[PDB]
Amino acid sequence: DIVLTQTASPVSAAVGGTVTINCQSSQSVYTNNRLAWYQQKPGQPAKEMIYGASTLPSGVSSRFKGSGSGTQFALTISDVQADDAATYYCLGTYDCLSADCLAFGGGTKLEIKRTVAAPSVFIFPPSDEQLKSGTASVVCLLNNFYPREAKVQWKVDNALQSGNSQESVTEQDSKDSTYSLSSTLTLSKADYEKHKVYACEVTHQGLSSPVTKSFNRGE
Amino acid sequence: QSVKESGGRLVTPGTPLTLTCKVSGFSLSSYYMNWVRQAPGKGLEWIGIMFPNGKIYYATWAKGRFTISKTSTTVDLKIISPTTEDTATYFCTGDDSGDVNIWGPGTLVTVSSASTKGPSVFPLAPSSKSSGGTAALGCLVKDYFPEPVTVSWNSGALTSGVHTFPAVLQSSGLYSLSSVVTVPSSSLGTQTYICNVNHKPSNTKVDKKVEPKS
């Protein structure tokens, strides 16, 4: 039942800027100084950024500063770079004879702010390969946009589709700080063959009017 | 200096399973070893620890549900009675109390009563509705289980422009994901594009060629 409460995510900064992430422990850590900070880029494992409240390991930039004691700690990242995009966890040590030896904080995501970029949009019809099995997947792709907020509207023969798509977004790109998204509408081969106009319509801050990409089935 | 987890597989609720972690470049009696897991999309949770002594301590929530043990060359984590709340990536770490802190790449444990299913791979063909020297193409890997699926392009020679999206859980209870790449338009006839899909939990491994359209 030890809980560490971090700053709410996200936490944002532009390249060159400065961020603080706070950790509050529900009871004092071992010798009021045993609190570490870990960096996790998505899909990777975590990296030790700071240990012993303020000790900076080798090969971790001095742009990372730990501070605090007792039940209150903070990691501060200065001169933020685009590859700092990750999620940061605190880890508290306690007395193994009276509580859990270790405990993790909820985590705080760092998002790198950059200029607003409108997506490049593409649409893909189903392959004949897939049709020959009873289902039809229409896919549209939004490429390299900032910020992540984007809405995709699916329209067949101009009727707004609801409930039959799913979407995925990449993680923020560690060089260009942008995002990418793919939407998949799935129909039965019957339904796909019944209609003609397939359209994906995108709405994003970086565009004043929505943009529409469409194909006509069998052209 | 190095650690690696293995053992993570699909497994029916209740049947036990042991993950193992094989050290490289140090001695078990010399580091602190911990197991840590991360359910998909959620955060790191700490399971338990083995001191250089040999003393072993568990998180309170973990007491009774896991066994941590060692065997000369490796550190082990047994999940005694897996529920679906136990599916996650499991991580092995090594710590010398000072400047070295070491993490394995992680191993995926899936608890369900579902069956392995290999994916089907379809092309997302470069079209006219897919710019100017900016042609988009890709692969759709659909209806597989469990995780994971890796995807590369031209056996690894194509790295730039590639976005492989996270998988989504469909209604059918099977995953589907796509991987796309942007490519010069002047390239579509000369150069050949092939996505290399590998779904090891079913020994599926298809390489699909993505050519344009008639």
Coordinates of C-alpha atoms in Angstrom, one line a residue, chain A residues 1 38 40 43-48 51 56-58 89 91 96-97 100-106 122-125 127 129-130 133 135 137 139 141-144 166-170 173 180-182 184 186 213-216 219, chain B residues 34 36 38 42-46 49 51 57-61 63 91 95 97-101 103-105 121-127 129-131 134 136-138 140 142 163-171 178 180 182 208:
Chain A
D1 CA 0.0 0.0 0.0
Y38 CA 14.0 6.0 -14.5
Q40 CA 11.5 4.6 -20.4
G43 CA 9.1 -0.5 -26.2
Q44 CA 12.5 -0.2 -24.6
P45 CA 13.3 -1.0 -20.9
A46 CA 13.9 1.7 -18.3
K47 CA 17.2 3.6 -17.9
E48 CA 18.5 4.8 -14.5
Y51 CA 19.6 7.4 -7.9
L56 CA 23.9 11.1 -11.4
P57 CA 25.2 7.9 -13.0
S58 CA 27.9 7.9 -15.7
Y89 CA 9.1 7.0 -13.1
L91 CA 11.3 4.5 -7.4
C96 CA 12.6 -4.4 3.9
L97 CA 11.8 -5.5 7.5
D100 CA 8.0 -3.2 0.6
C101 CA 11.6 -2.8 -0.3
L102 CA 10.8 -0.8 -3.5
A103 CA 7.8 1.0 -5.0
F104 CA 7.2 2.7 -8.3
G105 CA 5.4 6.0 -9.0
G106 CA 2.6 6.2 -11.5
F122 CA -3.3 8.6 -47.8
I123 CA -6.0 6.0 -48.4
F124 CA -5.6 2.3 -49.2
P125 CA -8.4 0.1 -50.6
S127 CA -6.4 -6.0 -51.5
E129 CA -6.0 -11.0 -51.7
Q130 CA -8.1 -10.1 -48.6
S133 CA -11.8 -14.4 -47.6
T135 CA -13.7 -9.2 -45.1
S137 CA -10.1 -3.6 -44.6
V139 CA -6.9 1.9 -44.2
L141 CA -2.9 7.0 -42.9
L142 CA -2.1 10.4 -41.4
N143 CA 1.6 11.0 -41.6
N144 CA 3.9 13.3 -39.5
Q166 CA -10.1 1.3 -35.0
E167 CA -7.1 3.5 -34.9
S168 CA -3.5 3.5 -33.7
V169 CA -1.0 6.3 -33.1
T170 CA 2.7 6.1 -33.0
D173 CA 9.2 10.8 -33.0
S180 CA 1.5 9.3 -37.2
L181 CA -1.8 7.5 -37.2
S182 CA -3.6 4.7 -39.0
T184 CA -8.8 0.9 -40.3
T186 CA -13.5 -3.2 -41.6
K213 CA -9.0 11.5 -49.3
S214 CA -11.2 9.0 -51.2
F215 CA -11.3 6.2 -53.8
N216 CA -14.0 4.8 -56.0
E219 CA -11.0 2.2 -60.7
Chain B
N34 CA 14.6 -7.6 -9.1
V36 CA 9.4 -5.8 -12.6
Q38 CA 4.5 -3.7 -17.0
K42 CA 0.3 0.8 -18.0
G43 CA 3.3 1.4 -15.7
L44 CA 6.1 -0.4 -14.0
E45 CA 5.2 -2.5 -10.9
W46 CA 7.8 -4.1 -8.7
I49 CA 14.1 -8.7 -5.0
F51 CA 19.9 -9.5 -2.3
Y57 CA 11.7 -10.0 -0.4
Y58 CA 8.4 -9.7 -2.2
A59 CA 6.1 -6.8 -2.6
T60 CA 3.0 -7.3 -0.4
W61 CA 0.7 -7.7 -3.4
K63 CA 3.3 -12.5 -1.6
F91 CA 11.7 -7.3 -16.7
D95 CA 22.1 -3.5 -9.6
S97 CA 24.2 -0.6 -5.4
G98 CA 26.2 2.0 -7.4
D99 CA 27.0 3.0 -10.9
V100 CA 25.6 -0.1 -12.8
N101 CA 21.9 -0.6 -13.3
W103 CA 17.7 -4.1 -17.6
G104 CA 16.8 -7.0 -19.9
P105 CA 14.8 -6.4 -23.0
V121 CA -0.5 -10.3 -44.4
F122 CA -2.0 -8.1 -47.1
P123 CA -0.4 -5.2 -49.1
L124 CA -1.3 -1.5 -48.8
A125 CA -0.4 -0.8 -52.4
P126 CA 1.2 2.4 -53.6
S127 CA -1.6 4.2 -55.6
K129 CA -4.2 8.2 -54.0
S130 CA -1.0 7.1 -52.2
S131 CA 2.2 12.9 -53.8
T134 CA 6.2 10.9 -51.8
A136 CA 3.2 5.6 -49.4
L137 CA 3.0 1.9 -49.3
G138 CA 2.7 -0.7 -46.6
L140 CA -1.4 -5.0 -43.0
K142 CA -4.4 -9.0 -39.5
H163 CA 6.1 3.8 -39.2
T164 CA 5.0 0.5 -37.7
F165 CA 1.9 1.2 -35.6
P166 CA 0.9 -0.4 -32.3
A167 CA -1.4 -3.4 -32.6
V168 CA -5.1 -3.0 -31.8
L169 CA -7.2 -5.7 -30.2
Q170 CA -10.1 -6.3 -32.6
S171 CA -13.6 -7.4 -31.6
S178 CA -0.1 -2.1 -40.0
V180 CA 3.8 1.7 -43.8
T182 CA 7.1 6.6 -47.5
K208 CA 5.1 -10.0 -48.9

